[PDB]
Amino acid sequence: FAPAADREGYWGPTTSTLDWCEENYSVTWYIAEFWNTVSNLIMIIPPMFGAVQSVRDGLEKRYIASYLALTVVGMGSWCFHMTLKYEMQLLDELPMIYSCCIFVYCMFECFKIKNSVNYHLLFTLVLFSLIVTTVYLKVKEPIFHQVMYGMLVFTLVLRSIYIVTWVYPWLRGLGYTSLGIFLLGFLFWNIDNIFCESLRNFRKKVPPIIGITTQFHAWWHILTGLGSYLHILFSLYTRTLYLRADLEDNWETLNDNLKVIEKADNAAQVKDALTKMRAAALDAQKATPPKLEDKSPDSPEMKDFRHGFDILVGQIDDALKLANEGKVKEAQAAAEQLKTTRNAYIQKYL
Numbered sequence: 434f435a436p437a438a439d440r441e442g443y444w445g446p447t448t449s450t451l452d453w454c455e456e457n458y459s460v461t462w463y464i465a466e467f468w469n470t471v472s473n474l475i476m477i478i479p480p481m482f483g484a485v486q487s488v489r490d491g492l493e494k495r496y497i498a499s500y501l502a503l504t505v506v507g508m509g510s511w512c513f514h515m516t517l518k519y520e521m522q523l524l525d526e527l528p529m530i531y532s533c534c535i536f537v538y539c540m541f542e543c544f545k546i547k548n549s550v551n552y553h554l555l556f557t558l559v560l561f562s563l564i565v566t567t568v569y570l571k572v573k574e575p576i577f578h579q580v581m582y583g584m585l586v587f588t589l590v591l592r593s594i595y596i597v598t599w600v601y602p603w604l605r606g607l608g609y610t611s612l613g614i615f616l617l618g619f620l621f622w623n624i625d626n627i628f629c630e631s632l633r634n635f636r637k638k639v640p641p642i643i644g645i646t647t648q649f650h651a652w653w654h655i656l657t658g659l660g661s662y663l664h665i666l667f668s669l670y671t672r673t674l675y676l677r678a679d680l681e682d683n684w685e686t687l688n689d690n691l692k693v694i695e696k697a698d699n700a701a702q703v704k705d706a707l708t709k710m711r712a713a714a715l716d717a718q719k720a721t722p723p724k725l726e727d728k729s730p731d732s733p734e735m736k737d738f739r740h741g742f743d744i745l746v747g748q749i750d751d752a753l754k755l756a757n758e759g760k761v762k763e764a765q766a767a768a769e770q771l772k773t774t775r776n777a778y779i780q781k782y783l
């Protein structure tokens with residue numbers, strides 16, 4: 434037909450190489466494509482809460498950068514979908530390549546020694562994103578960006594498939610949920626693109642989700658923001674399982690800290706050794722000592738090993754109580770008590 438377009442354009446002309454099938458400045462004069470802008474919050478707020486928990490918990494820098502990169506992508510999308518200029522378009526698109534390169538560094542370095550750097554992979558990813566950036570700006574074709582972004586997502590999918598198959602079967606539910614909702618999101622990306630018809634919104638009830646649920650590029654921000662959040666969880670869990678201590682480690686820590694308390698000269702050592710000992714005690718209590726590796730977790734010898742740990746833990750908790758009450762000399766005196774309870778109930782099984 435020959436009628437008035439539904440794009441009620443405002444606040445400057447669209448200087449971007451692409452415009453989505455959401456009516457320009459249709460809800461408000463402030464932003465072009467409203468749901469494509471407000472639907473980016475679950476990619477700005479959740480990854481910002483992850484980056485701050487990751488710093489508080491003292492995690493490896495690369496997992497903090499991963500969460501921050503996803504927030505940078507979120508803000509760039511919110512800005513591209515608000516203005517629709519080329520400057521804010523690249524702030525959505527280019528970070529996607531870089532954040533995906535951070536993800537490939539983490540996924541491929543997950544079984545490496547702590548405090549090591551792979552300068553080979555690092556300069557390779559830096560070169561790939563520099564080459565991709567240079568050609569992307571020169572020849573301004575957005576399908577080149579989409580194929581380059583999509584090839585990093587591809588290697589990241591194969592590396593995550595190797596891990597869930599050969600190394601950590603447990604992460605299957607998370608790894609495949611991350612992938613399922615990302616490919617559902619990518620189906621919705623192609624629906625808003627190919628099925629370009631503002632019929633359902635124009636027909637009935639636009640204010641409730643009757644009209645709003647047919648914004649399939651808004652759904653893509655939800656699903657890919659949620660799928661990219663789940664991929665960082667997956668990545669960080671692969672590193673947590675790898676770096677995790679076993680019975681031999683927890684038995685050593687528990688006893689090292691028992692000697693720190695005995696020989697301690699100040700309140701801060703005593704409280705730290707009691708806290709570290711309590712964590713190692715709860716962890717050791719779950720394991721089966723090597724003398725009992727042939728028995729059931731419910732055997733009388735196993736229930737007794739666990740019983741001694743229960744007694745030991747309550748005692749560590751009593752000594753921590755003394756520490757927090759300022760009874761330093763007394764909390765320190767628990768070391769002899771704690772040695773006696775590992776001798777009487779635990780050490781026979783080790």
Ligand SMILES: [Ca+2]
Binds near residue numbers: 453454456457466
């Ligand atoms: Ca549009």
Ligand SMILES: [Mg+2]
Binds near residue numbers: 493546547549
């Ligand atoms: Mg490290």
Ligand code: NA
Binds near residue numbers: 440
């Ligand atoms: Na337009």
Ligand code: NA
Binds near residue numbers: 679681682
């Ligand atoms: Na070991």
Ligand SMILES: [Zn+2]
Binds near residue numbers: 469510514650654
């Ligand atoms: Zn978008």
